Amino acid sequence: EETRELQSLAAAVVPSAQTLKITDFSFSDFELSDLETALCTIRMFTDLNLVQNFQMKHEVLCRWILSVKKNYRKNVAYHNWRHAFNTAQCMFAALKAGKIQNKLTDLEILALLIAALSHDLDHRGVNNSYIQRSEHPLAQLYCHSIMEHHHFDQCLMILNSPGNQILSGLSIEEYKTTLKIIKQAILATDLALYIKRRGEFFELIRKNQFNLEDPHQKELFLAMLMTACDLSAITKPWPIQQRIAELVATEFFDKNKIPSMQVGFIDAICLQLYEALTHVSEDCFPLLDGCRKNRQKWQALAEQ
Numbered sequence: 329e330e331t332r333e334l335q336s337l338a339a340a341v342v343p344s345a346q347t348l349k350i351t352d353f354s355f356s357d358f359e360l361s362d363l364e365t366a367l368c369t370i371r372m373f374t375d376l377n378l379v380q381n382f383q384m385k386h387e388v389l390c391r392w393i394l395s396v397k398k399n400y401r402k403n404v405a406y407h408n409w410r411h412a413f414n415t416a417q418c419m420f421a422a423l424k425a426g427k428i429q430n431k432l433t434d435l436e437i438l439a440l441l442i443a444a445l446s447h448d449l450d451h452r453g454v455n456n457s458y459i460q461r462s463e464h465p466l467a468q469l470y471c472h473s474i475m476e477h478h479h480f481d482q483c484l485m486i487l488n489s490p491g492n493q494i495l496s497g498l499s500i501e502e503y504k505t506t507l508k509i510i511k512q513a514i515l516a517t518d519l520a521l522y523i524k525r526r527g528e529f530f531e532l533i534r535k536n537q538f539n540l541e542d543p544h545q546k547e548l549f550l551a552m553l554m555t556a557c558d559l560s561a562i563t564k565p566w567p568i569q570q571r572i573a574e575l576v577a578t579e580f581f582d583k584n585k586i587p588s589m590q591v592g593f594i595d596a597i598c599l600q601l602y603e604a605l606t607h608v609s610e611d612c613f614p615l616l617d618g619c620r621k622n623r624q625k626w627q628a629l630a631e632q
């Protein structure tokens with residue numbers, strides 16, 4: 329049934345990060361089976377030293393990963409398991425290739441990876457729009473009166489389910505700190521909260537006053553990082569981004585104006601974010617470079 333899946337997952341060899349290409353910003357998931365994305369996820373926890381430092385039992389981490397995946401099964405494509413898996417992959421690539429890993433504590437890295445994986449688990453719970461089909465990120469802003477939201481209840485419920493407690497090896501003080509960061513990183517994937525707080529982040533960077541060691545600026549930086557990862561399909565190699573963008577038209581759920589939608593999207597949201605991210609961490613330039621190349625391809629298409 330799904331004992332089968334867990335048994336098969338826990339027994340399998342976990343290939344290296346290099347084999348799985350999860351350290352690349354150009355990572356493509358389409359050829360992977362769901363079960364291979366779970367192996368990729370295990371590898372992310374492993375290479376961030378989270379399995380070791382917090383003594384996560386292998387079977388427990390496998391079951392938690394499958395619990396998370398299972399609870400995405402009714403979500404639309406922009407908020408599904410593949411979305412959260414890729415949000416996590418971008419986080420991993422930005423932590424590793426982008427080197428952000430070195431700037432953060434282990435509890436921050438742990439909360440970030442769990443948040444990336446879990447941030448859309450409540451999409452059907454806290455939204456009455458947006459759940460029939462994948463809606464453009466900016467449909468929030470211009471189309472519906474009420475915006476598109478995220479929550480952490482499902483996240484914490486799965487984390488505390490018997491057999492799924494990847495955090496049992498934390499002390500009480502570590503657990504409390506981690507849950508707090510998880511809650512904020514999940515709420516930060518609300519585009520409303522990004523728009524509300526980004527100008528300050530940009531000013532600090534413009535004025536070269538950005539100080540990651542300030543508790544308000546660390547919260548704000550972790551939030552921008554969550555948004556960078558959540559929106560990262562806008563950075564992908566052109567064929568990936570085209571087919572994801574077109575899901576607003578192609579998703580079967582039980583293309584004429586898309587070029588101008590995506591250019592507007594890049595000009596109003598995406599370009600500044602990856603520009604700002606690259607000033608904090610120069611090795612995240614591939615996200616910005618990808619976002620630039622896609623604007624150029626979408627602009628050429630808009631010129632028909």
Ligand SMILES: COc1cccc2c1C(=O)N1CCc3c([nH]c4cccc(OC)c34)[C@@H]1N2C
Nearest residue numbers: 357358405406410411414415557558559560561
């Ligand atoms: C931060 O989110 C992303 C970043 C980079 C690539 C992304 C996404 C994302 O949201 N997604 C979500 C949609 C979908 C993806 N991969 C899939 C594989 C099979 C089916 C799918 O949708 C039905 C996808 C898929 N990709 C490629």
